[PDB]
Amino acid sequence: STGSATTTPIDSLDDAYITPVQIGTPAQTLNLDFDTGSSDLWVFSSETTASEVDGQTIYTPSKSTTAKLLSGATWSISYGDGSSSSGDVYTDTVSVGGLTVTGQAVESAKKVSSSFTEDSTIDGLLGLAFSTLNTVSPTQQKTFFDNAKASLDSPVFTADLGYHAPGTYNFGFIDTTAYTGSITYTAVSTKQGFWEWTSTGYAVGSGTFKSTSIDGIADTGTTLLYLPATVVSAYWAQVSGAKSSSSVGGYVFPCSATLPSFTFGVGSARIVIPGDYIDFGPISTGSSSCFGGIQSSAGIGINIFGDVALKAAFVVFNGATTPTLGFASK
Ligand SMILES: COc1ccc([C@H](N)c2nccn2C)cc1
């Protein structure tokens, strides 16, 4: 089998992407944030504290003839940005772009933190990291991809995120019309539960490529590109007036600037992030200070190839017995 679903930016900055997902019988369609950096499929629901729901579409398990309480199971997750959610668990039928999984753990939120409440466009998350990170207790649950994998034509999914435009998540096949050139594959470590890989270096604008190993994760659920402070300083030094602001929480730059591109290495191949992808707009409405899309990972503890990087590529998440990651230009 295969599935194919369009993913759409939630706002004009590409702060995140939502993909429609059918849950239950009859189907309840929720718009979920597909997140290769976590491993829980959780939704706003009829159980979510009413004051914490503000415009989201909710899953109502009592209206699904295929929903079953997973008795005794609870979940609780805290994300790198400080947001969090928790609740109980149902199993139900879940379909993405025509690909159906029966018995999928659907984690129903009883509580969500303020950042989730305040984002009316995201009805929940669909985790696509390794199932060893799933938070359900006392019986850990499998991701949608892990449950689908044996049925898929090929044990893979692909992320093709758009810049200011819709893109695509495919399951079970590589669309050879969706990228240019060849796909370069690179090794993955699953030891931390992430799609963790090592970039071979970087360049800033038209500058010379610096060969250096950068270990990080491919994370569709993180907006920005977080890299070591040395790399990030070298980037922003090429932008007149750019500076790290402790009050704002990162690098800012004059909104009047034209940003240079940023290139990262995948083996001997190179992915170029255009400068415009690195502009996240005014720090507050009407400000002439703009927020940078490349930020330091110092204090996170891991480098993160988030949407800024991944949307410059066609990315293959290869879940074969030995997982790997592929990147192509597009
Ligand atoms: C301080 O300046 C900022 C802060 C945030 C954004 C943007 N709306 C966003 N939401 C989630 C992630 N990002 C980048 C843009 C400028």
Q: Are 171 and 96 in contact (CB under 8 A)?
A: yes
Number of structural domains in the chain: 2
**Index of the ligand 1 atom closest to the CA of residue 283:** 2
The residue contributing the CA closest to ligand 1 atom 8 is 15
The residue contributing the CA closest to ligand 1 atom 6 is 280
CATH number of the domain where residue 299 is located = 2.40.70.10
88 noted as active-site residue = no
**Last residue within a domain, chosen from 174, 206, 232:** 174
The residue contributing the CA closest to ligand 1 atom 13 is 15
The residue contributing the CA closest to ligand 1 atom 2 is 283
**Last residue within a domain, chosen from 107, 142, 174:** 174
Quick one: 176 exposed, middle or buried, by C-beta within 10 A (0-12, 13-18, 19+)?
exposed
Question: Domain containing 129: what range?
Answer: 5-174
Q: Is the dihedral of CA 238, 200, 131, 63 positive or negative?
A: positive
Q: Which residues pair with 35 in a beta bridge?
A: 127
CA-based end-to-end distance of the chain: 25
Q: Which two tokens stand for residue 232?
A: 């990030």
Q: Are 324 and 284 in contact (CB under 8 A)?
A: no
35 noted as active-site residue = yes
Please name the amino acid found at residue 268. S
> Are 160 and 94 in the same domain?
yes
CA 147 to each of CA 76, 101, 155, 322: distance values in angstroms, whole numbers, following the listed order: 21, 7, 11, 17
Burial of 14-34, coded b for 16+ CB within 10 Å and e otherwise, reads bbbbbbbbbbbeeebebbbbb
> Are 180 and 95 in the same domain?
no
The residue contributing the CA closest to ligand 1 atom 7 is 15
- Residues 133 and 190: their CA atoms lie apart, in Å, by 10
* Catalytic residue, candidates 14, 35, 123, 160: 35
The 10 Å Cβ neighbour count of residue 177 is 6
> Are 142 and 221 in the same domain?
no
> Are 48 and 75 in the same domain?
yes
- Residues 216 and 195: their CA atoms lie apart, in Å, by 8
DSSP 293-309: SEEE-TTTSSEEE-HHH
> Are 270 and 154 in the same domain?
no
Distance of CA 272 from the midpoint of ligand 1 (Å): 22
**Index of the ligand 1 atom closest to the CA of residue 248:** 1
- Residues 4 and 158: their CA atoms lie apart, in Å, by 9
Question: Cβ neighbours of residue 215 under 8 Å, at least 6 residues apart?
Answer: 196, 197, 198, 199, 302, 303
Distance of CA 168 from the midpoint of ligand 1 (Å): 23
DSSP 330: -
Q: Are 216 and 304 in contact (CB under 8 A)?
A: yes
Q: Is the peptide bond before 26 cis (omega within 30 degrees of 0)?
A: yes
> Are 48 and 165 in the same domain?
yes
* Catalytic residue, candidates 64, 95, 131, 199: 199
Indicate the top mutation candidate among 114, 244, 291 to test ligand 1's pocket, ranked by most ligand atoms within 8 A of CB.
291
What is the arrangement of strands in the sheet containing 303-305, beginning at the earlier edge strand? 269-273, 262-266, 196-204, 210-218, 303-305, 225-227, 294-296
> Are 236 and 303 in the same domain?
yes
- Residues 112 and 52: their CA atoms lie apart, in Å, by 7
- Residues 136 and 39: their CA atoms lie apart, in Å, by 10
- Give the residue carrying structure tokens 């495919």: 170
**Index of the ligand 1 atom closest to the CA of residue 11:** 8
Q: Are 231 and 214 in contact (CB under 8 A)?
A: yes
- Residues 13 and 10: their CA atoms lie apart, in Å, by 8
Instruction: Please count the CA atoms within 13 angstroms of the CA of 198 that sit on its side-chain side.
Output: 6
The residue contributing the CA closest to ligand 1 atom 3 is 283
Given in angstroms, what resolution was this structure solved at? 1.2
> Are 73 and 164 in the same domain?
yes
Distance of CA 280 from the midpoint of ligand 1 (Å): 6
**What is the separation of C-alpha 125 from the centre of its chain, rounded to a whole number of angstroms?**
9
Coil, helix or strand for 290?
Answer: strand
- Residues 61 and 261: their CA atoms lie apart, in Å, by 47
Burial of 241-260, coded b for 16+ CB within 10 Å and e otherwise, reads ebebeeeeebbbbeeeeebb
> Are 62 and 90 in the same domain?
yes
Please name the amino acid found at residue 110. K
Q: Which long-range contacts (CB under 8 A, 24 or more apart) does 14-17 make?
A: 14/161, 14/162, 14/163, 14/164, 14/223, 14/307, 14/311, 15/223, 16/119, 16/122, 16/221, 16/223, 16/307, 17/161, 17/167, 17/220, 17/307
Solving technique for this entry? X-ray
**Last residue within a domain, chosen from 151, 174, 197:** 174
> Are 159 and 228 in the same domain?
no
> Are 38 and 137 in the same domain?
yes
> Are 191 and 305 in the same domain?
yes
Quick one: 10 exposed, middle or buried, by C-beta within 10 A (0-12, 13-18, 19+)?
middle
Backbone angles phi, psi at 149, to 5 degrees: -55, -45
Ligand 1 environment, Cβ below 6 A: 13, 15, 223-224, 248, 280-281, 283, 291
Question: Cβ neighbours of residue 161 under 8 Å, at least 6 residues apart?
Answer: 7, 14, 17, 167, 220, 307, 310, 311
- Residues 36 and 45: their CA atoms lie apart, in Å, by 22
Q: Are 227 and 236 in contact (CB under 8 A)?
A: no
- Residues 325 and 314: their CA atoms lie apart, in Å, by 11
Q: Which two tokens stand for residue 162?
A: 């758009």
Q: H or E segment at 145?
A: helix 144-148
Where do the DSSP E strands lie in 128-207?
Answer: 156-160, 167-171, 184-187, 196-204
